[PDB]
């Protein structure tokens, strides 16, 4: 634990990137989290929503 | 006045057939739907069957092929044919009458008939 | 909150219920909350795992 | 660079202008080679439908479903699809397709929808809030009405609680009225739950019989069995393509892989949940999916 | 044909520890070198798993609840356990599921069986005795497949019933332990998915008699119940689940 | 006003906590700021919105 200050910065940056990547899996109230599924399943008036 | 009377009950051997009749007096027999209900001693009411002016017969899913509901409109009567009698069909039977143009209130009831099966 | 040493060292844990009295949940009452699973000692050492309000936990069992 | 910095003079330095991404060269569609038509004629063109209290459920699987003969048919008055567009129904591969057939009157067709209230939604047939599928309904007065009155179709009038979604209540039980029990004739006389529809052909629109078929799907969670008519293309290695594997769309390079998939396992997912490997139908091989080259210019 | 077995010895069923058994693959997705958190119907770690014996005179075929799902473990030698019965009332009023594994093939049938009080198979010292049901009138689903199968063999199964689908997960393990469940980890691969679409609240184990009265071969099985909970599964470089964490067991695993 | 620097920090923290509490009384365009009123007055398809 001598080099904890640098490892803390590395872990925080990697964790922020991992959280940002993980947030793509959330649909945020939509029918799906995948854009291709929405574009292949719905007409543009509701796919727009 | 309105009146439902039944007949055909008694003490009969099990496996012998029965024909229970429900005669209606005082009201026109059309535009009303007729029910058969039974209840065992120590048990609650159990619905048997429905029949309409069309002739559509609807049975209880619990008991299958034991009964057959037959309406007749020339003399305003209703018949039940019971075949292959088991020992548990000892029951008091009731004839019921619903209006097709309202909630399912069964209005007046038959007084009931007694069926006792034994060996 | 779960107070633990490394899993390489031991699997014993203590539970801190923050801002909760001990009658509403090795049970010790701290100003931080109720600490269950740590034996309170009268000796003073350096802080190893911070609990709060001057309370710290260490492994030697888990003591507070 | 001039357009990015919004200036006609650009100073010395490095400037991020755009993001290069290689575009796909051709589209490959991979679908199961199976060519068994789905028995929609046994569902829509059946002679008899059951009542709405005892609605008929048919599981449709392991066949190719040609949806284009449904939407382009002018017989259906109501064709309302929730969670899927009806035009796109040919392009998608489904699993666990369910056909629910029953007969209801005219103004109750609006009650076959998610989030509706009424007798049919509460006590006869409940659709979930997250329902995906299609509700198809057409007038059937010239089959399901008789001049004396058709009585083959029933609806449940009352239940103690609302139904769960996709729950069938064929149980016909005598129920009470209030403040007097149903201990025979002696109390308030006991109400019956099932009432028959009065179908006559002289009845106005809104009371006439309408046949309803509800198709319900599940969107690509198992190895899919129900697929549209689309013809399967050949597979190309090491090139950027926009692929469609059983309704899963995307862009990437398909390469050989060394991932030891178990027999049940079909595809693979990364942390972001985007598909990283897939098992192609017809040939059962495992193709790795690597995103096409991109970066900053 | 039905036969009452009247030579049983009265004994209460036993209980033992689940350890870290009952973990199955939650989905059909390949995952490698990752830690995945999933919320599903799982068997809890170190739970109280019910132990039933078949020894000679013990013959344990009781009436057990199904609840949300059933983990079935079998310390088996010489092939006594042959199948299962699922249903609600186990008669012709409702529709019931039959899974059997006889000497030739595995048969799954969804019919309205009028089941016997003591359903069983029999081996003569050849199989020439089958008394499970007395009738089968309305059959909707049939599925004939390959044979699934000191105590030498360990059979783990997970039976789940969600959305009209019966998921059976299986794992076969060579063991050499004499009496109890070995302590270790083995992830159950999915075996079959059956579109039965029936209500299941009760289940029965099917055993086989040995005739030379009747004799029960040495076998033991364990019944555990699944609960909705979260596991943290570890996927190695080969896509195999090698370790698991019960998220609600103790504060350390939480 | 000798100890204004510490008092400013205490006031800012208390005011931020009070503002975070008072944001719960705002409906943000919904019919009510209370979840129970929405769940009791509307069906789940519109109560979800
Ligand atoms: C095996 O034992 C069971 C339980 O004693 C028997 O089931 C009973 O059989 C009698 C005779 O028909 C019925 O009156 C009871 O109602 C049955 N009990 C139940 C719970 O259903 C069974 O019949 C026996 N097997 C044989 C072949 O006689
Ligand atoms: C039902 O019959 C009509 C009569 O020609 C036909 O046009 C239609 O395609 C049929 N529908 C199905 C689903 O078979
Ligand atoms: C068709 O697909 C199946 C998998 O569903 C596969 O087993 C079979 O070999 C394929 N047939 C051809 C001719 O590609
Ligand atoms: C398992 O259950 C039995 C009775 O239900 C009980 O006596 C026993 O102590 C339990 N075992 C454990 C480890 O909880
Ligand atoms: C399943 O059966 C049990 C008892 O047999 C019953 O309480 C339950 O409501 C049934 N569920 C369904 C969906 O039929
Ligand atoms: C196994 O069961 C099947 C299903 O009834 C049957 O056809 C077959 O003959 C049985 N085999 C033996 C050896 O009993
Ligand atoms: C189930 O079987 C009984 C007797 O074999 C029969 O009367 C009944 O109609 C069957 N049910 C259906 C839905 O066919
Ligand atoms: C993964 O598989 C390889 C063989 O391809 C084997 O050598 C290795 O030991 C396996 N990994 C583990 C953790 O067992």
Residue numbers in the entry:
A (entry chain A), F (entry chain B): 943 to 991
B (entry chain H): 1 to 119
C (entry chain A): 596 to 620, 641 to 675, 691 to 694
D (entry chain C): 299 to 595
E (entry chain A): 14 to 69, 77 to 145, 153 to 176, 185 to 247, 257 to 298
What's the publication's text?
SARS-CoV-2 utilizes a trimeric spike glycoprotein for attachment to the host cell receptor angiotensin-converting enzyme 2 (ACE2) and for the subsequent cell entry step which involves the fusion of host cell and viral membranes. Given its crucial role in the viral replicative cycle, the spike protein represents an important therapeutic target and is a critical antigen in host immune responses. All emerging variants contain defining mutations within their spike proteins, with multiple mutations clustering within the receptor-binding domain (RBD) impacting both ACE2 binding and antibody neutralization escape, while mutations within the highly antigenic loops in the N-terminal domain (NTD) across these variants reduce antibody neutralization. Given the rapidly changing mutational and antigenic landscape of the SARS-CoV-2 spike protein, a structural understanding of spike protein mutational effects and the discovery of broadly neutralizing epitopes is of importance.
We next determined the cryo-EM structure of VH ab6 bound to the WT spike at 2.57 Å, showing that ab6 binds to the RBD in both the up and down positions, via a unique binding mode. Local refinement of the down RBD bound by VH ab6 enabled visualization of the ab6-RBD interface at 3.21 Å and revealed that the ab6-RBD interaction is dominated by contacts with the ab6 beta-sheet scaffold, which wraps around the RBD, extending this large interface to include its CDR2 and CDR3 loops but leaving the CDR1 loop free. This scaffold-mediated interaction necessitates a near perpendicular angle of approach for ab6 relative to the RBD, which likely can only be accommodated by a single VH within a bivalent fusion construct. Thus, the unusual angle of approach and dominance of scaffold-mediated contacts may account for the lower potency of the VH-Fc ab6 construct relative to VH ab6. The CDR1 and CDR3 loops of ab6 occupy positions that result in clashes with ACE2 upon superposition with an ACE2-bound RBD, with the CDR3 region directly competing with the amino terminal helix of ACE2 for RBD binding contacts, while the CDR1 loop poses a steric clash with the second helix of ACE2 without making RBD contacts. To confirm the ACE2 competitive nature of ab6 we employed competition ELISA and competitive SPR experiments. Both experiments demonstrate the ability of ab6 to compete with ACE2 for spike protein binding. Here, we present an antibody fragment (ab6) with neutralization activity against multiple variants (Alpha, Beta, Gamma, Delta, Kappa, Epsilon, and Omicron) and report its epitope within the RBD using cryogenic electron microscopy (cryo-EM). This antibody epitope is remote from most VoC mutations, explaining its ability to confer pan-variant neutralization.
